[PDB]
Amino acid sequence: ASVYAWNRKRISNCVADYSVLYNSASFSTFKCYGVSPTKLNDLCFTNVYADSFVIRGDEVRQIAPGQTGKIADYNYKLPDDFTGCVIAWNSNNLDSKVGGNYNYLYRLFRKSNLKPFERDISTEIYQAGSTPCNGVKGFNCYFPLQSYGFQPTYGVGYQPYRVVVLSFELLHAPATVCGPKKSTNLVKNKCVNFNFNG
Amino acid sequence: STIEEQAKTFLDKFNHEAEDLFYQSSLASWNYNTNITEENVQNMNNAGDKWSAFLKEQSTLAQMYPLQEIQNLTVKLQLQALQQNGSSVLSEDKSKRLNTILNTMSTIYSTGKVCNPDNPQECLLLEPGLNEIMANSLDYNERLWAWESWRSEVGKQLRPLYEEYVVLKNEMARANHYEDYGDYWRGDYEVNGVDGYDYSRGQLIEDVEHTFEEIKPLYEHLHAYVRAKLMNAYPSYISPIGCLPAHLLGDMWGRFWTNLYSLTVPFGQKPNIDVTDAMVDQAWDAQRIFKEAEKFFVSVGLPNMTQGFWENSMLTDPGNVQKAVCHPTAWDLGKGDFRILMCTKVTMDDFLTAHHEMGHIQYDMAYAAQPFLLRNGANEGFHEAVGEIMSLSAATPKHLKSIGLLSPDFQEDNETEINFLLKQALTIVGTLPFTYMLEKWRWMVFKGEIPKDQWMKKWWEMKREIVGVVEPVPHDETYCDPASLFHVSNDYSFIRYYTRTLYQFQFQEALCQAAKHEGPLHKCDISNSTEAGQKLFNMLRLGKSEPWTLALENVVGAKNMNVRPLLNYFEPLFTWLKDQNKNSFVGWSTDWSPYA
Ligand SMILES: *[C@@H]1O[C@H](CO)[C@@H](O)[C@H](O)[C@H]1NC(C)=O
Ligand SMILES: *[C@@H]1O[C@H](CO)[C@@H](O)[C@H](O)[C@H]1NC(C)=O
Ligand SMILES: *[C@@H]1O[C@H](CO)[C@@H](O)[C@H](O)[C@H]1NC(C)=O
Ligand SMILES: *[C@@H]1O[C@H](CO)[C@@H](O)[C@H](O)[C@H]1NC(C)=O
Ligand SMILES: *[C@@H]1O[C@H](CO)[C@@H](O)[C@H](O)[C@H]1NC(C)=O
Ligand SMILES: *[C@@H]1O[C@H](CO)[C@@H](O)[C@H](O)[C@H]1NC(C)=O
Known part of the structure; x- marks a missing residue:
């Protein structure tokens, strides 16, 4: 999806194996905020929010708590008290075509900054001046969503990057998204310390 | 709300769409240059028309924001750059006539073919048919014939x-509130609104005269030495007291004197510093040349080339089937796309050209953080000067020994340096005098100091006075002798070479003082010095956001262009020329004493 209309998938009631993601060599950014990757495979969470979008190479740094920019203010805002991981990888092979891929958009103007985890899909003309826009993109009245022009011959700061942000929250409901606990080979007829289902 | 925020949002909806349209146009121009085919010409023309129409619409929309209600200097600079009418203030008939005149001058210059009367079955074009004759012939009347026939046609x-x-x-x-077109060209160096660092359009001519008055003794001694050597080469044509004949300078117009190095060499018996054979013996590919240039730029501390540079550049001639322009050009296509189009041979000249164009690429990369309409040099001189300083540094024998291209037991004596x-x-x-004379003549033509019936009588008078070059035979007003050159016939500014030449040695002194070089200035190499690269990159990162006077303060510590670094660079040569000119007469006479 586009960054203005970022896809949110709610992940519940399953087993989340995070070591498959962490040990992959295909990811360029795996920056986790509020938690470390080593204890992800141990801890258990109530729900997982997977937000997916495409941004530029130079805009990956703005997907962080406390940052400022077009993406943070107008497209996708992260809270300061955010627990989760931001995973980004280059997708110049898929999301760039030789003619120019203009299927991706970004809200360039809004009257106020976004709240954390807010989605704005409105297509109303931004009013920068005192005169009413009246629905026409004339003087001082600009269209909010501006397209990205992805091409495969671009620089590394302009190449498309697919970003998946996983948000981990703990609520008073029973946490059901747990990691895969391993199973040490059962040994019989010896005095051993057993741990069966807790 | 406020006017300033409205202008900022307008500049952002300019910038974002502009970078992508300039990219499309630049890519179309690149595809034309690497593939000369008619559909690529049509795509280039369509992209250029879209780019020009988009610039027209944004110029039409930018003027509605008045300048005096904006206080931020960068926003005011971009709005000043955008609000220029250009040719749009002129009527559509006269604009079409001007465009037609420019196009027909382009066709006349590009397709101008001249050969000898009574032998018309084949003819030679300027490049390379006439260039080789002007650069290599030793016959007086053949060069006179080619020069007079090409300036006649x-x-x-x-x-x-x-x-x-x-x-x-x-x-x-005058429709754009300028005094003349010369004032329009001098407005590139105009700095307004900065306390202390303001520069005026009228100060440029005074600064050029002030620097050229100090240029003049060195050029007089060099002209006397070249006159004596050409008298040795041509016994009877050149007078001891007069100017040089125009067709003997080694080039078509007198732009460069570098084709007289064989005739005017001081010590022919001593060897040259030619490294061509050493690269041929070690089989140095053009890829190795660009990698050594990249090693030079990482040695000074500048960023190395992108992967897209190595993937997307054409550094070799494609072949017979595919046609490409042979001229070396660095392309800043936009959006972090940097390419070099050069048909690189294994020569010293192509190696220095590779360093020069990679300096252009480094300059383009440095202001990539700037907004789109500020992505330029602070003036037109800096952009060429940052390539010419790399051409200076790469040409040193220390650089050749460091990269292994020169023998470590090569004897560097004073004669080779001379x-x-x-x-x-x-x-x-x-x-320098040719550039100054041409720009001063064009300024006087635009200002109206010289009437149309008196253009050439003054012009040759200027050439005798400034360049010290006499016409072979007198020319009347049916001739147009300046416009045989590419830049003047195709509406290009010419003072960029003068400013580039002075900024080159100013930057060279600044970086060599930064690098703590302890010898002669021409023996100085800016490799291995992180602080010199940092001092360079501080100015390089600014782009057009800051005034060129403030950038020059950032590099050399001076608020104005200076002539003393050039004289310091050639000071051993200046003393040697003063020693060699004891018997001969320095200076020339404006009279017709050699030939007219
Ligand atoms: C150049 O244009 C010709 C025209 O047919 C085309 O066949 C060829 O593939 C092109 N080459 C490149 C490198 O674009
Ligand atoms: C001028 O505008 C730029 C953005 O266009 C901003 O970064 C800069 O801080 C502004 N300068 C002043 C003095 O307000
Ligand atoms: C451009 O031309 C228009 C129409 O003649 C004029 O109103 C405007 O002031 C001009 N712009 C400048 C910067 O002079
Ligand atoms: C540029 O330098 C960096 C760090 O020295 C290196 O990782 C990178 O591969 C270099 N780029 C190229 C194209 O070699
Ligand atoms: C070069 O040095 C030698 C030895 O010191 C000296 O004899 C000669 O005159 C010098 N030549 C020049 C041009 O300085
Ligand atoms: C600059 O550094 C490189 C890296 O070791 C070295 O090979 C080179 O010799 C140095 N330059 C000089 C002039 O010593």
Whole structure:
């Protein structure tokens, strides 16, 4: 999806194996905020929010708590008290075509900054001046969503990057998204310390 | 809400769409240059028309924001750059006439073919047919024939066209609240609104005269030495007291004197510093040349080339089937896309050109953080000067020994430094009076100081006074002798070479003082010095956001262009020329004493 209309998938009631993601060599950014990757495979969470979008190479740094920019203010805002991981990888092979891929958009103007985890899909003309826009993109009245022009011959700061942000929250409901606990080979007829289902 | 925020949002909806349209146009121009085919020409023309129409619409929309209600200097600079009418203030008929005049001058210059009367079955074009004759022949009347016949055909075609051109450009400039077109060209160096660092359009001519008055003794001694050597080469044509004949300078117009190095060499018996054979023996590919240039730029601390540079550049001639422009050009296509289009051979000249164009690429990469309309040099001189300093540094024997191209037991004595400095003076110092005379003549033509019936009588008078070059035979007003050159016939500014030449040695002194070099300035190499690269990159990162005076304060610590670094660079050569000119007469006479 586009960054203005970022896809949110709610992940519940399953087993989340995070070591498959962490040990992959295909990811360029795996920056986790509020938690470390080593204890992800141990801890258990109530729900997982997977937000997916495409941004530029130079805009990956703005997907962080406390940052400022077009993406943070107008497209996708992260809270300061955010627990989760931001995973980004280059997708110049898929999301760039030789003619120019203009299927991706970004809200360039809004009257106020976004709240954390807010989605704005409105297509109303931004009013920068005192005169009413009246629905026409004339003087001082600009269209909010501006397209990205992805091409495969671009620089590394302009190449498309697919970003998946996983948000981990703990609520008073029973946490059901747990990691895969391993199973040490059962040994019989010896005095051993057993741990069966807790 | 406020006017300033409205202008900022307008500049952002400019910038974002502009970068992508400039990219499309630049990519179309690249595809034309690497593949000369008619559909690529059509795609280039369509992209250029879209780019020009988009610039017209944004110029039409930018003017509605008044300048005096904006206080931020960068926003005011971008709005000042955008709000220029250009040719749009002129009427559509006169604008179409001006465009037609420019196109027909382009066709006349590009397709101008001249050969000898009574032998018309085949003819030679300027490049490379006439260039090789001008650069290599030793015959007086053959060079005289080629020079007079090409200025006869080109001037007699272009004189009414230039007479229309000056009137149309003056009309456009006075419609844009300028005094003349010369003031429009001098407005590139105009700095307004900065306390102390302001620069005026009228100060440029005074600064050029002030620097050239100090240029003049060195050029007089060099001209006397070249006169004595050409008297040795041609016994009877050259007078001891007079100017040089025009067709003997080694090039078509007198732009460079670098083709007289064989005739005017001080010590022919001593060897040259030619490294061509060493690269041929070690089989140095053009890829290795660009990798060594990249090693030079990482040694000074500048960023290395992107992966897209190595993937997308054409550094070798494609073949017979595919046609490409042979001229080396660095392309900043936009959005972090940087390419070099050069048909690189295994020569010293192509290696220095590779360093020069990679310096252009480094300069383009440095201001990538800037907004789109501020992505330029602070003036037109800096952009070429940052490539010419790399051409200076790469040419040193220390750089050749460091990269292994020169033998470590090569003897660097004073005679090789003298003849190298003389070659650099014939390339660099010799273009300065021609450039100054051409720009001053064009400024007086646009200002109206010279009437149309008196253009050439003054012009040759200027050439005798400034360049010290006499016409072979007198020319009347049916000739148009300036417009045989590429830049003047195709509406290009010419003071960029003068400013580039002075900024080159100013930057060279600044970086060599930064690098703590303890010898002569021409023996200085800026490799291995992180602080010199940092001092360079501080100015390089600014782009057009800051005034060129403030950038020059950032580099050299001076608020104005200076002539003393050039004289310090050639000071051993200046003393050697003063020693060699004891018997001969320094200076020239403006009279017709050699030939007229
Ligand atoms: C250049 O244009 C010709 C025209 O047919 C085309 O066949 C060829 O593939 C092109 N080459 C490149 C490198 O674009
Ligand atoms: C001018 O505008 C730029 C953005 O266009 C901003 O970064 C800068 O801080 C502004 N300068 C001043 C003095 O307000
Ligand atoms: C451009 O031309 C228009 C129409 O003649 C004029 O109103 C405007 O002031 C001009 N712009 C400048 C910067 O002079
Ligand atoms: C540029 O330098 C960096 C760090 O020295 C290196 O990782 C990168 O591969 C270099 N780029 C190229 C194209 O070699
Ligand atoms: C070069 O040095 C030698 C030895 O010191 C000296 O004899 C000669 O005159 C010098 N030549 C020049 C041009 O300085
Ligand atoms: C600059 O550094 C490189 C890296 O070791 C070295 O090979 C080179 O010799 C140095 N330059 C000089 C002039 O010593």
